[PDB]
């Protein structure tokens, strides 16, 4: 569970496990893909999805799921979790705003991006419907199964950590977690590299003038920008994607019906939609005289139909069509 | 090469709320320790009661929990019970192995005194078909768990040949211990009164055989 | 934590004054004001006023506006009560307390008064070892009877207080206009009379202490 | 100006759940009277165990609640406990000063029976030497706290001489008193046998000096 | 901690400890300063600001935070209590509805203020992001150590408590909470001022046409209006703010960069930006002949550059210049 | 309780027993009545209309209420509930979002429905205040003493229950909740209607090919179109609706006051509101010439008054009126 | 037309944890049973415990509670107590009917032993009017509940005329029993010493007359 | 609070009715309804239906449908199981309760019937004194002998009720076609015989009741 710099974090710019990337509004029913710098899913080692690993200090913290929150404008709907990233139906927002509740503490995380939800269809929505037409909208997956990308997941580098850089009674005292890789001098010429297990510091005794950090890439991360890389190589670690965008026919918008009225040669439409839907026609001579316009006010229009025939399409309603003789 | 440390020995009564507390030499306990409590009752029994600083193992009591209180972890047993008359260890994880603590031993009232049960028998006689003759004389079920054991071949106290183990827990939470005086074949058919003299808590019980 | 701990009991004749001290531990005195209760040998329990130990100002119950003055060693920790031309009526016992969460939580030992007239006549201090035959059992008991002394209180320990456990000290009780109090320790009958065991006891009204090492009868 | 009501005793047995009440002759009692509950338990020993009505002082057991149950403040002790037996003090407040009630004495149902430990001493020779003789019996751990003492001189029941102190709780919850039987050194030196008899929960105890 | 008449409590009016007045959404950062009628800071006595003591009764309750919720159109975060007053980051809303959680009841309060977050900037942002330039914001503080300006707060008036006006088994009966002062009469004649400890009353006997009143000016108030004015004098309390506007930078906006395109003495500029944004020129000859438009939706513009120069200003991104020789 | 057809219940359409029906964001007051499915109110037998009765399983839950939630765009606020039906006071909302606690699971229900609110005035608000003018508003009530109109309610259809169709060790096993009338038959010829106890089935074995079915009519249900029909008859049960439609005076809008400015014949108003105000005049001539504008941006307006006089109606304040000779 | 199952007998000791389940012969339990639980304390003495599935009967210790485990109901007693000895029972709902379980016999370890007390009456006289005679014999306050009685006229075991009740059980939950032997007038007034022998927990007290 | 009372227990020969009343106290009867439910002797427990206070209209389980008939005088809170033409397996114990909870919270005492043929033959009731010779402790043992009766069931008090700690009451038991009881009472030995000590008897059945006072054997 990568940890990453959250940038309004309740307060401000926190570090939070679950710093927020890589917002994706670009579907279409109400979801998101999200990745936080928190791998929930399984535990550390190997059970059940629906429990969750952030980082606390250096160390993950394998535990329940208990109290997850995304949330924008107004509240969302989790999805489903896999890996690093969440998959959440929310509704349109300014920001994206994502938070669990570990029990002692909030401990939330939030962002800015650009979100909305047009259906697809001729009609403007802000919001699935229960009923409607099925046609084919752009949607993620609820699985994990998935293979169908892969982003790049090398190492991490390296960390800080000033608990390690204790006093040794006058001198500054570094530790190790578990015999990692701790790299360490401080601003006086003392020990230059550090790959070690607990050393002390002969020279410098100020822990604010100290290289306090954590070489421990026993576990890969996602290459978040707002991680520092890992110097030494290119790490393996190539690492799938679960939530890919499918081709879902999302249950979908449809808007009344027109009225349709006669005259000569002339369609009056007293129209009267739920939502801003684009009506457009196509007088079917070699002079095609199209017409578009959004409608979400109700209007009476007027279309002058010629001899050998116009269609009329009601939002994602079929395409009508029409003999004026 | 760090060092947890915890109390020694804390005594409690039925009912109390005690506190025992396991400090690390390297700096304040935190989170990233997962503090663990275990703890051990009598016949090497290790059961483990916290996890994770506060996270109470499935079926212990919630008489029990933990937290960190100040710069270390603490259990707080709230209700001690006499059952809790044990000794708990702490642990703490530091990036790549564990540190336990010394323990505490802890005593909780309870458990009203109980006085022993002795018994003394003859060396047998397949026994004394060997050119030896062992008496050995059994204690059970005695509580406080301290006694002492005297032998008296024929009035006097014998003071050589004797060996008496030490009070070692049954599962009720009592003691037992045996005591064996070693003759001969010989010494054994020559003094004619053999005497187990128990003293516990304040009584004494003698269990005399007669050859 | 806290420890309210006040002054000893004391004996004083009608028209007298006294003060009562109470020495606060554990807590800032400053943010914890200290209220008064008075407990009367059978009334039960009465607030008698609060003193602000931040300001000074004192609250009197109706009760206890006159004869009765708060006041304090802020410096040391103390709030005292000062009963002054006591009445006879005034023997109880009195508490300090310190008023927080919404109430009383900590209460001190008490201090009890007993306005009474008489002289001064210092104890008579009697070794109590057991019976000149035998006493033979796992333990022994032994005591210590402090005899015919005025007024109250006297003070009584055992081995200059380093014994404690096992003693029963018994209630100072009013008998032919003399006090008389005893006490009984008891300890393994490889103690006593191996090691020394001494009752010690003050009566400070007449500035009498009496270091008495129990003996054997023979 | 205004007088708090409470029961005057209550009996309960370890374990149960009991409700005490506090009651306001002005009023219902209201979240404004910040209703405290105190205990007092023998020795002139006070602490404070609910305030501001419900608010339980630090280090009281949890089995303690406060509420307001109508019109008046309660206390709930939840599993009643032996060492509950003590008596409760409501306290009310009325915009500038307090008003405690009478208090409530609660016999919790526990602590077995002890039998008294009696012991009578003969007047020492320091006291002999002042033409005086006192025989004190000392009677400590007994419960019930309720014994009879009686003297007889010679054979014959003294009616004349003694004071018995009234039964004192001591810190373990069992009672202690003393008699006195007060002669002159020569109603010392007459009668030849003295005899101190204590009578609890039945069994008598009788504990005799022989000059 | 005052209590006062919230407007639409839950059901409607009711008189709530955490009656809202002064809702000033007057800053930029997403804040507002709001005053409960509750005084939540330290207890009664003396600890923790994070504790909270509102008016239940005649009587304070200085407990425990656990759920406070300020809310708008979503719900808030809070920034800081201190005294009567909290400051909480809340997004735009035609309403303010701010609540606790007592834990027996959900005890809320909610008003009507029109609110807005305008960032500072030619941008017009619904919200702060994590990045952007730094520019002077109008913004309220974290902290309480704060002088900077001081509202009255003098005593309260009396107030009603009925609880007290029992009966004395045929006449109504007063009492008093500590000693205070209740003043007192019915519309019969009786006892007519009412300086006192628990009095009855001889004349009346309703409980529906007496004086239950409490003179308890042991602590000052807020001088909400509404309160009744405690009529006998201006008392002292001159009490400060801490919650001073103050000139904070925020982490500010920023608008996409523009599409320069060359023509003859013409910018063409195709543009595209994340939120509207004020852009605007200034043809730097004696004749100024200036521009302003708000530009939301992305747009290809035209500016005749003159010979000497133009400037251009793509949002609160620094002003740009330019030779058109 | 009824249990129908939710359509976007978390995931997707499940089955909710607080299947959301007939959405009515019709009055003016914040409030929308809502039918769930469910009947809440009092238990199964007596008690406590603040008691929580759904349908789990084909049995009842009559449990406590402890965490409903209705909620929009934002989180509503509960009025009362009464049967079936609920009233909530909801901000406006593309949706409507309805859902419970039940204690280990969310187990919400939500739904499309086009809800605002117009307070009743020329004054178009988002919200109510706290303040203006009271006057005849659209509202429902808080209360259940109420008969102005009943719905029909007569029984339930059957409803599937394939717990039943449990195994007879070779032969799949029909049972009876209570005696309950089970109306069964296979895909093979077996047992023809199904009025009966626990029977077994000689001839199929697949329970995917069976009747598993409930004629439980001993309680009547709502008539919800997510209902299938009881095909025997149209039983009794007309049942009322609490929550008429009545004629509430809801505390309601009012504008800031006008800046009446002079000039000959000529009303020069700056004018500057709270929200979008529909101002309209009236020159009294019986030429009419009157107007009618939304005004929400301030504005600086004018009015050629007459000799005989001009009226003024600045938002639902009361109108006015002006002598211009 | 269903059947509920539940445990026949568990035994627990003071202060453990037990749980006890209710089967339903038709499929899992679920809510919509609305799970009941009974508990019968001797002299036919029922109290409801918990109700639709896990609502405690009000003044019923919290040490009780209910819930749905896998797919049965059950019962779990948190810190068992000797007081819970009894028989508990499940109940069912199924749409039309209740169905009770068959009660699970639970036995908490406490209580400590108690001897029993007895007392043997002659015939009364009134009685020996009627030309008969019946020696009455009552044995009260026993624990565990189990005796054995045997009468010995003159010395010999009388094993014929006697008659002994089943061990009943008292309020404090310690048991009681009477056993009469029956002889006549004259049967009476021919042998001369009579006795009632009670066994109980390893001790035996015997009760004789003379007449 | 709520209590629910039963009437005695009775006996009755095959063929013979029953009415078994239930007096409900603490609650509202209109708002809860009653269980009834038969505990056979050996059996366990079993519903026998249920009956709406409120409309009056019973559920009856299907094994108790015919002769089982429950009623309620409403008006006195009261609910009633009358048992027709009772069969001699009807032998049982039957307890009214109260549904509530969504179960049932409270359960009445019981009333108990024993099916059986038999007359009517009146008690017997003898005194138990202690031995005639000494019987000197801190406390004295009574007792109250209740022979050859029928049917069931007797009624036994001491001291008109007043006296009922200490008490012992055995139940009946059939013994060559007659019942049989008995009951000891233990007091301090100063009560009796100083104190007068009574058994009071009564056999409903025969209309018979006995005071008969314990007197000393000599």
């Known amino acids: 569970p990568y940890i990453a710099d959250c940038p309004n974090c309740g307060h401000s710019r926190c570090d939070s496990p679950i710093a927020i990337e890589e917002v994706r509004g670009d579907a279409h029913a109400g979801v998101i893909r999200i990745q936080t710098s928190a791998m929930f899913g399984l535990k550390t080692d190997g059970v059940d999805l629906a429990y969750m690993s952030f980082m606390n200090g250096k160390t993950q913290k394998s535990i329940k799921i208990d109290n997850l929150h995304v949330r924008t404008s107004a509240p969302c709907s989790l999805v489903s979790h896999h890996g690093y990233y969440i998959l959440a139906q929310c509704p349109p927002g300014d920001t994206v705003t994502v938070g669990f509740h570990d029990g002692p503490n909030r401990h939330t995380c939030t962002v800015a991006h650009k979100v909305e939800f047009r259906p697809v269809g001729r009609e403007k929505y802000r919001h699935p419907p229960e009923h409607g037409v099925e046609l084919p909208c752009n949607r993620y997956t609820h699985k994990r199964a998935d293979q169908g990308h892969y982003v790049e997941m090398h190492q991490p580098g390296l960390v800080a950590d000033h608990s390690l850089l204790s006093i040794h009674s006058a001198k500054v005292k570094i530790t190790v977690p578990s015999g990692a890789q701790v790299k360490y001098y401080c601003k006086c010429p003392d020990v230059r590299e550090g790959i070690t297990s607990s050393d002390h510091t002969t020279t410098c005794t100020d822990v604010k003038q100290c290289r306090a950090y954590l070489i421990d890439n026993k576990k890969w991360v996602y290459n978040s920008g707002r991680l520092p890389r890992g110097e030494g190589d290119t790490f393996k670690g190539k690492l799938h994607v679960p939530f890919v965008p499918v081709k879902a026919k999302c249950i979908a918008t449809l808007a009344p019906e027109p009225l349709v009225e006669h005259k000569h040669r002339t369609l009056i439409l007293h129209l009267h939609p739920d939502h801003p839907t684009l009506l457009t026609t196509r007088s079917l001579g070699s002079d095609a005289n199209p017409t578009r316009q959004w409608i979400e006010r109700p209007t009476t229009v007027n279309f002058t139909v010629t001899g050998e025939g116009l269609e009329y399409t009601w939002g994602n309603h079929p395409p009508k069509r029409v003999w004026a003789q | 090469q760090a060092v947890v440390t915890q109390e020694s020995a804390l005594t409690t009564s039925p009912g109390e709320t005690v506190t025992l507390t396991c400090?690390?030499?390297?700096?304040?306990?935190?989170?990233?320790?997962?503090?663990?409590?275990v703890q051990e009752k009598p016949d090497h029994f290790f059961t483990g009661?916290?996890?994770?600083?506060?996270?109470?193992?499935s079926g212990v009591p919630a008489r029990f929990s933990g937290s960190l209180i100040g710069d270390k972890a603490a259990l707080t047993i709230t209700g001690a019970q006499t059952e809790d008359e044990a000794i708990?260890?702490?642990?703490?994880?530091?990036?790549?192995?564990?540190?336990?603590?010394?323990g505490t031993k802890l005593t909780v009232l309870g458990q009203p005194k109980s006085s022993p049960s002795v018994t003394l028998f003859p060396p047998s006689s397949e026994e004394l078909e060997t050119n030896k003759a062992t008496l050995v004389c059994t204690i059970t079920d005695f509580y406080p768990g301290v006694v002492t054991v005297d032998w008296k071949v024929d009035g006097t106290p014998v003071t050589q040949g004797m060996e008496t183990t030490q009070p070692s827990k049954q599962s009720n939470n009592k003691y037992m211990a045996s005591s064996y005086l070693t003759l001969t074949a010989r010494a054994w058919e020559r003094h004619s009164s053999y005497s187990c003299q128990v003293t516990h808590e304040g009584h004494t019980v003698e269990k005399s055989l007669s050859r | 934590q806290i420890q309210l701990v006040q002054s000893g009991r004391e004996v004083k004749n009608p028209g007298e004054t006294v003060k009562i001290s109470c020495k606060a531990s554990?807590?800032?005195?400053?943010?914890?004001?200290m209220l008064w209760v008075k407990q009367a040998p059978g009334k039960g329990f009465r607030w008698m006023g609060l003193?602000?130990?931040?300001?000074?100002?004192?609250t009197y119950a109706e009760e206890f506006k006159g004869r009765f003055v708060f006041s304090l060693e802020i410096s040391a920790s103390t709030a005292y009560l000062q009963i002054n031309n006591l009445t006879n009526e005034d023997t109880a016992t009195y508490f300090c307390?310190?008023?927080?969460?919404?109430?009383?939580?900590?209460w001190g030992q008490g201090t009890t008064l007993t306005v009474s007239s008489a002289k001064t006549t210092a104890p008579s201090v009697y070794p109590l070892a057991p019976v000149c035959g035998g006493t033979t059992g796992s333990s022994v008991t032994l005591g210590c009877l402090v005899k015919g002394y005025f007024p109250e209180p006297v003070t009584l320990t055992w081995n200059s207080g380093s014994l404690s456990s096992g003693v029963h000290t018994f209630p100072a009780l009013l008998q032919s206009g003399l006090y008389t109090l005893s006490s009984s320790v008891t300890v393994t009958s490889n103690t006593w009379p191996s090691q020394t065991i001494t009752c010690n006891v003050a009566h400070p009204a007449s500035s009498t202490k009496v270091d008495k090492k129990i003996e054997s009868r023979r | 100006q205004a007088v708090v009501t409470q029961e005057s005793a209550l009996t309960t047995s370890p374990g149960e759940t009991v409700t005490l009440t506090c009651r306001s002759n002005?009023?219902?009692?209201?979240?404004?009277?910040?209703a405290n509950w105190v205990q007092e338990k023998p020795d002139h020993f006070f602490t404070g165990l609910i305030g501001?009505?419900?608010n339980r002082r630090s280090g009281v057991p949890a089995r303690f609640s406060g509420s307001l149950i109508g019109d008046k403040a309660a206390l709930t002790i939840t599993g009643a406990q032996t060492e509950d037996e003590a008596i409760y003090f409501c306290?009310?407040?009325?915009?500038?000063?307090?008003?405690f009630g009478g208090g409530t004495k609660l016999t919790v149902l526990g602590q077995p029976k002890s039998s008294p430990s009696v012991t009578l001493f003969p007047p020492s020779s320091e006291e002999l030497e002042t033409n005086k003789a006192t025989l004190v019996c000392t009677i400590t751990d007994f419960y019930p706290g309720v014994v009879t003492v009686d003297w007889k001189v010679d054979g014959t029941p003294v009616t004349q001489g003694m004071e018995t102190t009234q039964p004192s709780k001591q810190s373990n919850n069992k009672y202690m008193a003393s008699s006195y039987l007060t002669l002159t050194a020569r109603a010392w030196e007459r009668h030849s046998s003295y005899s101190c008899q204590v009578t609890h929960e039945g069994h008598t105890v009788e504990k005799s000096l022989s000059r | 901690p005052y209590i006062a008449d919230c407007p639409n409590c839950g059901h409607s009016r009711c008189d709530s400890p955490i009656a809202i007045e002064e809702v000033r959404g007057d800053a930029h950062a997403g804040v507002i300063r709001i005053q409960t009628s509750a005084m939540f800071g330290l207890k009664t006595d003396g600890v923790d600001l994070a504790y909270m003591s509102f008016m239940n009764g005649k009587t304070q309750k200085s407990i425990k935070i656990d759920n406070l919720h300020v809310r708008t159109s979503a719900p808030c975060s809070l920034v800081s209590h201190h005294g009567y007053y909290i400051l909480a980051q809340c997004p735009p809303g035609d309403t303010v509805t701010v609540g606790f959680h007592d834990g027996p009841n959900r005890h809320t309060c909610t008003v009507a203020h029109k609110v807005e977050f305008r960032p500072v900037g030619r941008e017009k942002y619904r919200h702060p992001p994590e990045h952007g330039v730094e520019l002077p914001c109008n913004r309220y503080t974290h902290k309480r150590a704060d002088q900077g300006h001081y509202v009255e707060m003098h005593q309260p008036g009396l107030v009603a408590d009925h609880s007290l006006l029992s009966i004395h088994s045929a006449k109504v009966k007063i009492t008093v909470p500590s000693g205070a002062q209740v003043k007192y009469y019915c519309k019969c004649p009786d006892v007519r001022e009412g300086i006192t400890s628990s009095d009855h009353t001889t004349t009346c006997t309703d409980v529906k046409q007496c004086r239950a009143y409490l003179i308890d000016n042991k602590k000052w108030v807020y001088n909400s209006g509404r309160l009744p004015r405690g009529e006998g004098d201006t008392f002292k309390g001159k009490l400060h703010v801490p919650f001073v506007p103050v000139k904070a930078k925020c982490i500010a906006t920023l608008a996409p960069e523009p599409l320069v395109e060359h023509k003859h003495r013409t910018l063409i500029l195709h543009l595209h930006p994340d939120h509207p944004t004020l852009l605007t020129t200034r043809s730097l000859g004696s004749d100024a002949n200036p521009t302003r438009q708000w530009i939301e939706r992305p747009t290809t513009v035209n500016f005749t550059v003159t010979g000497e120069g133009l400037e251009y200003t793509w949002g609160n991104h620094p002003p740009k210049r330019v030779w058109a020789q | 309780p009824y249990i129908a057809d939710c359509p976007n219940c978390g995931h997707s359409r499940c089955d909710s027993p607080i299947a959301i029906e007939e959405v009515r964001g019709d009055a003016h007051a914040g409030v929308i009545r809502i039918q769930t499915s469910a009947m809440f109110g009092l238990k199964t037998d007596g008690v406590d209309l603040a008691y929580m009765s759904f349908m789990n399983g084909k049995t009842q839950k009559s449990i406590k209420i402890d965490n409903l939630h209705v909620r929009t765009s934002a989180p509503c606020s509960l009025v009362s509930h009464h049967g079936y039906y609920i009233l909530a006071q909801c901000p406006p909302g593309d949706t409507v979002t309805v859902g419970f606690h039940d204690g280990p699971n969310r187990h919400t229900c939500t739904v499309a429905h086009k809800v605002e609110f117009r307070p009743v005035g020329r004054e178009k608000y988002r919200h109510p205040p706290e303040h203006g003018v009271e006057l005849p508003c659209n509202r429902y009530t808080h209360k259940r003493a109420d008969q102005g109109h009943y719905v029909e309610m007569h029984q339930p259809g059957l409803v599937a229950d394939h717990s039943l169709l449990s195994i007879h060790s070779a032969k799949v096993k029909i049972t009876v909740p209570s005696g309950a009338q089970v109306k069964y038959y296979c895909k093979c010829p077996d047992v023809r209607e199904g009025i009966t106890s626990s029977d077994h089935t000689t001839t199929c074995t697949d329970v995917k090919q069976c009747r598993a079915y409930l004629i439980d009519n001993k309680k009547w249900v709502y008539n919800s179109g997510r209902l299938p029909r009881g095909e025997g008859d149209t039983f009794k049960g007309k049942l009322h609706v609490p929550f008429v439609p009545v004629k509430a005076k809801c505390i309601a809008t009012l504008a800031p006051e006008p800046l009446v400015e002079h000039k000959h014949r000529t009303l020069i108003l700056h004018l500057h509101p709270d929200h979008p105000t529909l101002l309209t005049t009236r020159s009294l001539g019986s030429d009419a010439n009157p107007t009618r504008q939304w005004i929400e941006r301030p504005t600086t307006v004018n009015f050629t008054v007459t000799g005989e006089g001009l009226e003024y109606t600045w938002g639902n304040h009361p109108p006015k009126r002006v002598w211009a000779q | 037309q269903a059947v509920v199952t539940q445990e026949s007998a568990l035994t627990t000791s003071p202060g453990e944890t037990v749980t006890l389940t209710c089967?339903?012969?038709?499929?899992?339990?679920?809510?919509?049973?609305?799970?009941?639980?009974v508990q019968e304390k001797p002299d036919h003495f029922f109290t409801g415990?918990?109700?639709?599935?896990?609502?405690?009967?009000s003044g019923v210790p919290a040490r009780f509670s209910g819930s749905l485990i896998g797919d049965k109901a059950a019962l779990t007693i948190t810190g068992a107590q000797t007081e819970d000895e009894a028989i508990?029972?499940?109940?069912?709902?199924?749409?039309?009917?209740?169905?009770?379980?068959?009660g699970t016999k639970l036995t908490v370890l406490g209580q400590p032993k108690s001897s029993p007390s007895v007392t043997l009456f002659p015939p009364s006289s009134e009685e020996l009017e009627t030309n008969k005679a019946t020696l009455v014999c009552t044995i009260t306050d026993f624990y565990p509940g189990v005796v054995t009685v045997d009468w010995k006229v003159d010395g010999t075991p009388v094993t014929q005329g006697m008659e002994t009740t089943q061990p009943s059980k008292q309020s404090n939950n310690k048991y009681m029993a009477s056993s009469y032997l029956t002889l006549t007038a004259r049967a009476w007034e021919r042998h001369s010493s009579y006795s009632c022998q009670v066994t109980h927990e390893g001790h035996t007290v015997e009760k004789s007359l003379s007449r | 609070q709520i209590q629910l009372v039963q009437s005695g227990r009775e006996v009755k020969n095959p063929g013979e009715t029953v009415k078994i009343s239930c007096?409900?106290?603490?609650?509202?009867?209109?708002?809860?309804?009653?269980?009834?439910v038969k505990q056979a002797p050996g059996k366990g427990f079993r519903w026998?239906?249920?009956?709406?206070?409120?409309?009056?209209?019973?559920?009856?389980?299907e094994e108790f449908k015919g002769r089982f008939v429950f009623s309620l005088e409403i008006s006195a809170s009261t609910a009633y199981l009358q048992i027709n033409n009772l069969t001699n397996e009807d032998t049982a114990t039957?307890?009214?309760?109260?549904?509530?909870?969504?179960?049932?919270?409270?359960?009445?005492?019981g009333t108990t019937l024993t099916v059986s043929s038999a007359k009517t033959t009146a008690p017997s009731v003898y005194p138990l004194a202690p031995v005639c010779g000494g019987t000197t402790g801190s406390s004295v043992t009574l007792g109250c002998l209740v022979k050859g009766y029928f049917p069931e069931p007797v009624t036994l008090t001491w001291n008109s009720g007043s006296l009922s700690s200490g008490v012992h009451t055995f139940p009946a038991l059939l013994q060559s076609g007659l019942y049989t009881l008995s009951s000891s009472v233990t007091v301090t030995s100063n009560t009796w015989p100083s104190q007068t000590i009574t058994c009071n008897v009564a056999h409903p059945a025969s209309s018979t009741k006995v005071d008969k006072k314990i007197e000393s054997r000599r």
């Open positions: 501001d009505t419900n």
């Open positions: 306290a009310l407040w009325y915009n500038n000063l307090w008003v």
């Open positions: 002005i009023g219902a009692v209201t979240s404004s009277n910040c």
């Open positions: 554990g807590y800032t005195f400053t943010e914890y004001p």
């Open positions: 307390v310190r008023d927080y969460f919404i109430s009383l939580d900590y």
């Open positions: 003193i602000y130990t931040n300001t000074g100002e004192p």
